[PDB]
Coordinates of all heavy atoms in Angstrom, one line a residue:
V291 N 45.3 -54.4 -92.1 CA 45.3 -52.9 -92.3 C 46.5 -52.6 -93.2 O 47.6 -53.2 -93.1 CB 45.5 -52.2 -90.9 CG1 45.6 -50.8 -91.0 CG2 44.2 -52.5 -90.0
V292 N 46.3 -51.6 -94.1 CA 47.3 -51.2 -95.0 C 48.1 -50.0 -94.4 O 47.6 -49.1 -93.9 CB 46.7 -50.7 -96.3 CG1 47.7 -50.1 -97.2 CG2 46.0 -51.9 -97.0
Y293 N 49.5 -50.1 -94.5 CA 50.4 -49.0 -94.1 C 51.0 -48.6 -95.4 O 51.7 -49.4 -96.1 CB 51.4 -49.4 -93.0 CG 50.8 -49.5 -91.6 CD1 49.9 -50.5 -91.3 CD2 51.0 -48.5 -90.7 CE1 49.4 -50.6 -90.1 CE2 50.4 -48.6 -89.5 CZ 49.5 -49.6 -89.2 OH 48.9 -49.7 -88.0
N294 N 50.8 -47.3 -95.8 CA 51.2 -46.8 -97.1 C 51.8 -45.4 -97.0 O 51.7 -44.6 -97.9 CB 50.0 -46.8 -98.1 CG 48.8 -46.1 -97.6 OD1 48.9 -45.4 -96.6 ND2 47.7 -46.2 -98.3
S295 N 52.4 -45.1 -95.9 CA 53.0 -43.8 -95.6 C 54.2 -43.9 -94.7 O 54.2 -44.8 -93.8 CB 52.0 -42.9 -94.9 OG 52.6 -41.6 -94.7
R296 N 55.2 -43.0 -94.9 CA 56.3 -42.9 -93.9 C 55.9 -42.3 -92.6 O 56.7 -42.3 -91.6 CB 57.5 -42.2 -94.6 CG 58.2 -42.9 -95.7 CD 59.4 -42.1 -96.1 NE 60.3 -42.9 -96.9 CZ 60.3 -43.1 -98.3 NH1 59.4 -42.4 -99.0 NH2 61.2 -43.8 -98.9
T297 N 54.8 -41.6 -92.6 CA 54.3 -41.0 -91.4 C 53.7 -42.0 -90.5 O 52.9 -42.8 -90.9 CB 53.2 -39.9 -91.7 OG1 53.7 -38.9 -92.6 CG2 52.6 -39.3 -90.5
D298 N 54.2 -42.0 -89.2 CA 53.7 -43.0 -88.2 C 52.2 -42.9 -88.1 O 51.6 -41.8 -88.0 CB 54.4 -42.8 -86.9 CG 55.8 -43.5 -86.9 OD1 56.0 -44.6 -87.4 OD2 56.7 -42.9 -86.2
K299 N 51.6 -44.0 -88.0 CA 50.1 -44.2 -87.8 C 49.9 -45.1 -86.7 O 50.6 -46.1 -86.5 CB 49.6 -44.6 -89.2 CG 48.4 -45.4 -89.2 CD 47.8 -45.5 -90.6 CE 47.7 -46.9 -91.1 NZ 46.8 -47.0 -92.3
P300 N 48.8 -45.0 -85.9 CA 48.5 -45.9 -84.9 C 48.3 -47.3 -85.4 O 47.8 -47.5 -86.5 CB 47.2 -45.4 -84.2 CG 47.2 -43.9 -84.6 CD 47.9 -43.8 -85.9
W301 N 48.6 -48.3 -84.5 CA 48.2 -49.7 -84.7 C 46.8 -49.8 -84.0 O 46.7 -49.5 -82.8 CB 49.2 -50.6 -84.0 CG 49.0 -52.0 -84.4 CD1 48.6 -52.6 -85.6 CD2 49.1 -53.1 -83.5 NE1 48.5 -53.9 -85.5 CE2 48.8 -54.3 -84.2 CE3 49.4 -53.3 -82.1 CZ2 48.8 -55.6 -83.6 CZ3 49.5 -54.5 -81.6 CH2 49.2 -55.7 -82.3
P302 N 45.8 -50.0 -84.8 CA 44.4 -49.8 -84.3 C 43.8 -50.9 -83.5 O 42.9 -51.6 -83.9 CB 43.6 -49.5 -85.6 CG 44.3 -50.4 -86.5 CD 45.8 -50.3 -86.2
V303 N 44.4 -51.1 -82.3 CA 44.0 -52.2 -81.3 C 43.5 -51.6 -80.0 O 44.2 -50.7 -79.4 CB 45.2 -53.1 -81.0 CG1 44.9 -54.1 -80.0 CG2 45.8 -53.7 -82.3
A304 N 42.4 -52.0 -79.6 CA 41.8 -51.7 -78.2 C 41.3 -52.9 -77.6 O 40.6 -53.7 -78.2 CB 40.8 -50.6 -78.3
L305 N 41.5 -53.1 -76.3 CA 41.0 -54.2 -75.5 C 39.8 -53.7 -74.7 O 39.8 -52.6 -74.2 CB 42.0 -54.8 -74.5 CG 43.4 -55.2 -75.2 CD1 44.3 -55.6 -74.1 CD2 43.1 -56.4 -76.1
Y306 N 38.7 -54.5 -74.7 CA 37.5 -54.3 -74.0 C 37.4 -55.4 -73.0 O 37.1 -56.6 -73.4 CB 36.3 -54.1 -74.9 CG 36.1 -52.7 -75.5 CD1 37.0 -52.2 -76.3 CD2 35.0 -52.0 -75.0 CE1 36.7 -50.8 -76.8 CE2 34.8 -50.7 -75.4 CZ 35.6 -50.2 -76.3 OH 35.4 -48.9 -76.7
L307 N 37.5 -55.1 -71.7 CA 37.6 -56.2 -70.7 C 36.5 -56.0 -69.7 O 36.4 -54.9 -69.1 CB 39.0 -56.2 -70.0 CG 40.2 -56.1 -71.0 CD1 41.4 -55.8 -70.2 CD2 40.3 -57.5 -71.7
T308 N 35.7 -57.0 -69.4 CA 34.6 -56.8 -68.4 C 34.8 -57.9 -67.3 O 35.1 -59.1 -67.6 CB 33.3 -56.9 -69.1 OG1 32.3 -56.4 -68.2 CG2 32.9 -58.2 -69.6
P309 N 34.6 -57.6 -66.0 CA 34.9 -58.5 -65.0 C 34.0 -59.7 -65.0 O 32.8 -59.6 -65.2 CB 34.7 -57.7 -63.7 CG 34.9 -56.3 -64.1 CD 34.3 -56.2 -65.5
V310 N 34.5 -60.9 -64.7 CA 33.7 -62.0 -64.5 C 33.0 -61.9 -63.2 O 33.4 -61.1 -62.3 CB 34.5 -63.4 -64.5 CG1 35.2 -63.6 -65.8 CG2 35.5 -63.4 -63.4
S311 N 31.9 -62.6 -63.1 CA 30.9 -62.5 -62.0 C 31.4 -62.7 -60.6 O 30.9 -62.1 -59.7 CB 29.7 -63.4 -62.2 OG 30.2 -64.8 -62.3
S312 N 32.5 -63.5 -60.5 CA 33.1 -63.8 -59.2 C 34.3 -62.9 -59.0 O 35.0 -63.1 -58.0 CB 33.5 -65.2 -59.2 OG 34.4 -65.5 -60.2
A313 N 34.6 -61.9 -59.9 CA 35.8 -61.0 -59.7 C 35.6 -60.1 -58.4 O 34.5 -59.7 -58.1 CB 36.0 -60.2 -60.9
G314 N 36.7 -59.8 -57.7 CA 36.7 -59.0 -56.5 C 38.1 -58.6 -56.1 O 39.1 -59.1 -56.6
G315 N 38.1 -57.6 -55.1 CA 39.4 -57.0 -54.7 C 40.3 -56.4 -55.8 O 39.8 -56.0 -56.8
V316 N 41.6 -56.4 -55.6 CA 42.5 -56.1 -56.6 C 42.5 -57.3 -57.6 O 42.7 -58.4 -57.3 CB 44.0 -56.0 -56.1 CG1 45.0 -55.8 -57.2 CG2 44.0 -54.8 -55.1
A317 N 42.1 -57.0 -58.8 CA 41.9 -57.9 -59.9 C 43.1 -57.9 -60.9 O 43.4 -58.9 -61.5 CB 40.7 -57.6 -60.7
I318 N 43.7 -56.7 -61.1 CA 45.0 -56.6 -61.9 C 46.0 -55.9 -61.0 O 45.7 -54.8 -60.5 CB 44.8 -55.8 -63.2 CG1 43.7 -56.5 -64.1 CG2 46.1 -55.6 -63.9 CD1 43.2 -55.6 -65.2
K319 N 47.2 -56.6 -60.8 CA 48.2 -56.0 -59.9 C 49.1 -55.0 -60.7 O 49.5 -55.3 -61.8 CB 49.1 -57.1 -59.3 CG 48.3 -58.0 -58.4 CD 49.2 -59.1 -57.8 CE 48.4 -60.1 -57.1 NZ 49.0 -61.5 -57.2
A320 N 49.5 -54.0 -60.0 CA 50.4 -53.0 -60.5 C 51.7 -53.7 -61.0 O 52.3 -54.5 -60.3 CB 50.8 -51.9 -59.5
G321 N 52.1 -53.3 -62.2 CA 53.4 -53.9 -62.7 C 53.2 -55.2 -63.5 O 54.1 -55.6 -64.1
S322 N 52.0 -55.8 -63.5 CA 51.8 -57.1 -64.1 C 51.6 -57.1 -65.5 O 51.0 -56.1 -66.1 CB 50.6 -57.8 -63.4 OG 49.4 -57.2 -63.6
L323 N 52.0 -58.1 -66.2 CA 51.7 -58.4 -67.6 C 50.3 -58.7 -67.7 O 49.7 -59.5 -67.0 CB 52.6 -59.7 -68.0 CG 52.4 -60.1 -69.5 CD1 53.1 -59.1 -70.4 CD2 52.9 -61.5 -69.8
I324 N 49.6 -58.0 -68.6 CA 48.2 -58.2 -68.9 C 47.9 -58.9 -70.3 O 46.9 -59.5 -70.4 CB 47.3 -57.0 -68.7 CG1 47.8 -55.8 -69.7 CG2 47.4 -56.5 -67.3 CD1 46.8 -54.6 -69.7
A325 N 48.8 -58.7 -71.2 CA 48.6 -59.2 -72.6 C 49.9 -59.3 -73.3 O 50.8 -58.5 -73.1 CB 47.6 -58.3 -73.3
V326 N 49.9 -60.2 -74.3 CA 51.0 -60.2 -75.4 C 50.2 -60.1 -76.7 O 49.4 -60.9 -77.0 CB 51.8 -61.4 -75.3 CG1 52.8 -61.5 -76.5 CG2 52.7 -61.4 -74.0
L327 N 50.5 -59.1 -77.5 CA 49.9 -58.8 -78.8 C 50.9 -58.9 -79.9 O 52.0 -58.3 -79.8 CB 49.2 -57.4 -78.8 CG 48.3 -57.1 -77.6 CD1 47.8 -55.7 -77.7 CD2 47.1 -58.1 -77.6
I328 N 50.6 -59.8 -80.8 CA 51.6 -60.1 -81.9 C 51.0 -59.3 -83.2 O 49.9 -59.6 -83.7 CB 51.8 -61.5 -82.3 CG1 52.1 -62.3 -81.0 CG2 52.8 -61.7 -83.4 CD1 53.3 -61.9 -80.4
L329 N 51.8 -58.4 -83.7 CA 51.6 -57.7 -84.9 C 52.3 -58.4 -86.0 O 53.6 -58.6 -85.9 CB 52.1 -56.2 -84.7 CG 51.9 -55.3 -85.9 CD1 52.1 -53.8 -85.4 CD2 52.9 -55.6 -87.0
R330 N 51.6 -58.8 -87.0 CA 52.3 -59.5 -88.1 C 52.3 -58.6 -89.4 O 51.2 -58.1 -89.8 CB 51.6 -60.8 -88.4 CG 52.2 -61.6 -89.6 CD 51.4 -62.9 -89.7 NE 51.9 -63.8 -90.7 CZ 51.3 -64.9 -91.1 NH1 50.1 -65.1 -90.7 NH2 51.8 -65.7 -92.0
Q331 N 53.5 -58.4 -89.9 CA 53.6 -57.6 -91.1 C 54.1 -58.3 -92.3 O 55.2 -59.0 -92.2 CB 54.6 -56.4 -90.8 CG 54.9 -55.5 -92.0 CD 56.3 -55.7 -92.5 OE1 57.2 -55.9 -91.7 NE2 56.5 -55.6 -93.8
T332 N 53.4 -58.2 -93.4 CA 53.8 -58.7 -94.7 C 53.7 -57.5 -95.7 O 53.5 -56.4 -95.3 CB 52.8 -59.8 -95.1 OG1 51.5 -59.3 -95.0 CG2 52.9 -61.0 -94.2
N333 N 53.9 -57.8 -97.0 CA 53.8 -56.7 -98.0 C 53.3 -57.3 -99.4 O 53.1 -58.5 -99.5 CB 55.2 -56.0 -98.1 CG 56.3 -56.9 -98.5 OD1 56.1 -57.7 -99.4 ND2 57.5 -56.8 -97.9
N334 N 53.3 -56.4 -100.3 CA 53.0 -56.8 -101.7 C 54.2 -56.9 -102.6 O 54.0 -56.8 -103.9 CB 52.0 -55.8 -102.3 CG 52.7 -54.4 -102.6 OD1 53.8 -54.1 -102.1 ND2 52.1 -53.7 -103.5
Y335 N 55.3 -57.1 -102.0 CA 56.6 -57.2 -102.8 C 57.4 -58.4 -102.7 O 58.0 -58.9 -103.7 CB 57.5 -56.0 -102.3 CG 58.9 -55.9 -102.7 CD1 59.1 -55.7 -104.1 CD2 59.9 -56.1 -101.9 CE1 60.5 -55.6 -104.5 CE2 61.2 -56.1 -102.3 CZ 61.5 -55.9 -103.6 OH 62.8 -55.9 -104.1
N336 N 57.6 -59.0 -101.5 CA 58.4 -60.2 -101.3 C 57.8 -61.1 -100.3 O 56.6 -61.0 -100.0 CB 59.8 -59.7 -101.0 CG 60.0 -59.0 -99.7 OD1 59.1 -59.1 -98.8 ND2 61.1 -58.4 -99.4
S337 N 58.6 -62.0 -99.7 CA 58.1 -63.0 -98.8 C 58.2 -62.6 -97.3 O 57.9 -63.4 -96.5 CB 58.8 -64.3 -99.0 OG 60.2 -64.2 -98.8
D338 N 58.5 -61.4 -97.1 CA 58.7 -60.9 -95.7 C 57.4 -61.2 -94.9 O 56.3 -61.0 -95.2 CB 58.9 -59.4 -95.6 CG 60.3 -59.0 -96.1 OD1 61.2 -59.8 -96.3 OD2 60.5 -57.7 -96.2

Side-chain angles (χ1 to χ4, degrees):
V291 174
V292 173
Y293 284 73
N294 57 10
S295 181
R296 289 186 166 92
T297 300
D298 278 323
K299 152 166 118 161
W301 191 43
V303 177
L305 304 175
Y306 275 69
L307 309 170
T308 193
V310 301
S311 58
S312 59
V316 178
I318 298 166
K319 293 179 192 146
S322 69
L323 181 72
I324 61 170
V326 173
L327 310 176
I328 309 298
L329 181 165
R330 179 180 184 191
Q331 174 253 322
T332 55
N333 62 39
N334 71 343
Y335 172 69
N336 66 13
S337 61
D338 288 351

